[PDB]
């Protein structure tokens, strides 16, 4: 057989296996995945509805929060579910066709599918209720989403390679994912921040990607200084190259 | 069970990719109609504010102004001329509410908080008609402001950018929309194919 | 034709380092040697579990993975999903995997609690389904490592019966410790120690080799 | 075919061809673009930020572009460099594309804390860039004065003025065509892309058995 | 590692030229809002017309090229106008304290007398520019804004910016 | 006493559930910011005052 059909068959098999184990019972995990964003939208709207109303008189809080949150859930899943993709399926590397990166890309594909489906149904629901649901620049939004997906997958693969023998490293990065949820401007708009802290926040690629996706989504959305796509694009490319090189080096060390 | 095996993924990619792109390409390159857009940028000042600009923004998308403009320039007759286009053509015998929604879709009003300048973009099927409608909107807006000031018991409209005469259509963007639909259809087909494969595997 | 070309594999003792070896064609060969001397690495590489850093093993015919590998089953999934997973990896057809799962569930005889994950699974039925899966695939070099079956007398009896039925037209590889079955099936022997391997046409020299060098 | 790709073919397709194309375009077919920079601010003479916002919007307008084209023949000037197809204004284009090109050539930046509007005008000759910047400044001042005049007349002498902190400077050398920096960063990006692609294809070929 | 240290040390202790710094501290006040004029002045110091006036006043082009053994900090002959402006911006440092509204001007130079003269010329040209910028709006209808000197320009005695030992230690860090 | 009591209670409850230990380790971090450790608490709008009175 061709060396590519084997990869396709292995990827399909691992995707089916991981979907089977991810959904507990008769697909009970999909309810959990659906109830995270509505709970988040409820608590944050109840808290800062008046805050956003005082922030800017052009965007309602549900849509702003949903397009700032679903991509971040995408990134957080692509970071968290990917480091555990190597140790959990350690026993499967005995069939002459399963490699460590195959489980990684299968987990990445399934995360992509699940979160994209969630984004689609949530956007449809928001449009059904009466809110804004059509992006003004769809191609730029797709490009930003692809860049964010590549960056998240690269970071996940890099962490899976690095912390194979160090579970405590996985623990501390799981701890540190939470401050990234607050320093990426997911909840509140970032232009209401003193400028002295502005350059220190320019080093976060996720903030750049979130702001650019919101700009491509909303009409006439103002973009402040230093939110170019070049920095997150280079960050993602460099991280992907580093992760692939590290996996190529530490390739035969995974049992 | 039988239905999932009926797709064979070939009719599936035909019905999720080939048919929508074929239909969209035919509509865009055959039946779509040009829509020239004229742009103006105005604001209101006293001849000696922000709230008056907000009142103007509300007034532009109102029904009294639409009635005045329909009596003056006959917008309803003009917007029904492109019989080739079934989507962006105002059909005959429509209701008042549908006419109002159509007019609100054609005329776009935007305001920024930092500068306080109100920009109006008026669509049409002729550059001359779009420019004329924009000029009429501006004239009626300044007349409304002056009448409000008079009946309150001395204001003027600052026209930073007068209405322009467009040279080519800009809004019926065919290739960008085709690429967007291609990306959307590819993603939808991939997701649907994966889901149908999963359910086909799980059912038996 | 299984042929070795200057194999090198780091496990800092170099277990195997740029040696070449040849193997007989259509002759029953069983790998034998001292435990921990490098035989486990050699049969794992023969089964394709790991690839050599230098050199290659070549064979024009496919090699079956070693039998009785409990690690090859995911704990959270039962036997049916695991067997369909591995057959999908091997790219079988629809009726193909229907036949394979039917054969493996007939061989298991664990129809009650058949769809039970490996987390709450006894060792006996785990070994039964492992042997059934390893038998369900059609090959001609079986890397049999540990025993043949787990159960009562009739379990091993019919396992050996079907093994002789399926091996009589093919070739079988044994890496074990008891020499009764090696005398019964195997013909030629390769002995591995500290990275050097010696080939004996007759196991009679292998008996002396074990008595002296081990 | 995918399985028939070699390292040298990947290097030629990914790295070498864009390198040659970019080097040939930048070192031969690229046209110089001199920049004239000025810094202005509008204040009353007899709420200034309102007038600065009006000027910022009016500079990138179309009526100002119409006056500038009628005065200095911008369309004839910008179409002169034939050897550079990317940054030249092709003849017979649309009015909307002409406005987009003019908005791309002229950059307007604002310092709100200082309230200073800086205008950077690009041109293919330094004298033309300086003349365009001077004409833009004169037209902005005239527009502010005209607005004040009509606002005063609607109820029924220069009242507002535009101070020039820095007059339009005549450039000596081209600034915006950065051949070497662009070549270096594109080389780095291209090398990274080639490395990633080679690693991916090696990972794919790892499944050969 | 040893070769870069050798070449850096021999350049610093043999080839590097001294650069004297003169310091001034100013602010602008209405005699009879000041932040606006202060920011206008801050922009004006690094402008090009001011550099031109300084060039036909003090001939900075000749002075900055007088060293010959320090090619790193030398204004080479036949350089462009833009590079000359960048060099002048590098040589003259302007700092602003907003909580006090004070502008500090540090002028570099290979001779202390020329550095002090350059600082004084900058100060007087800034005062004249403020006066003229007010006067143009004054007579568009047809002496009120004075710049006070908290610290007048000083005459340095020793070089300050060629900190050889500190830069050598910083290179030793890397 | 409160800390030791909470530790003993969690050790008893989550003996067989390491994921429970993980999620409480996650949620310890927001408690570090909602306890007024960093910034003084009287510079907080009163509408959020009663909600913070439960800590």
Residue numbers in the entry:
A (entry chain C): 14 to 268
B (entry chain F): 3 to 50, 72 to 176, 321 to 371
C (entry chain A): 1 to 11, 17 to 219
D (entry chain G): 5 to 50, 71 to 180, 319 to 371
E (entry chain H): 19 to 50, 71 to 180, 320 to 351
F (entry chain D): 163 to 217
What does the report in the manuscript say about this coordinate set?
CPS secretion is mediated by an ABC transporter containing KpsT and KpsM as its nucleotide-binding domain (NBD) and transmembrane domain, respectively. The transporter partners with the periplasmic and inner-membrane-anchored KpsE subunit, a class-3 polysaccharide co-polymerase (PCP), as well as with KpsD, which is assumed to form an outer-membrane pore. The KpsMT transporter is surrounded by a cage of eight KpsE subunits extending about 80 Å into the periplasm. Cryo-electron microscopy analyses of the KpsMT–KpsE complex in six different states reveal a KpsE-encaged ABC transporter, rigid-body conformational rearrangements of KpsMT during ATP hydrolysis and recognition of a glycolipid inside a membrane-exposed electropositive canyon.
In a nucleotide-free state, our cryo-EM analyses resolve two apo KpsMT conformations (Apo 1 and Apo 2). Apo 1 shows well-separated NBDs with minimal interactions mediated by TM5 between the KpsM subunits. In this conformation, the gap between TM1 and TM5 of opposing KpsM protomers creates a deep electropositive canyon that extends from the NBD into the transmembrane segment. The canyon ends near the periplasmic membrane surface at the interface between TM1 and a short periplasmic reentrant helix (PGH1) following TM5 of the opposing subunit.
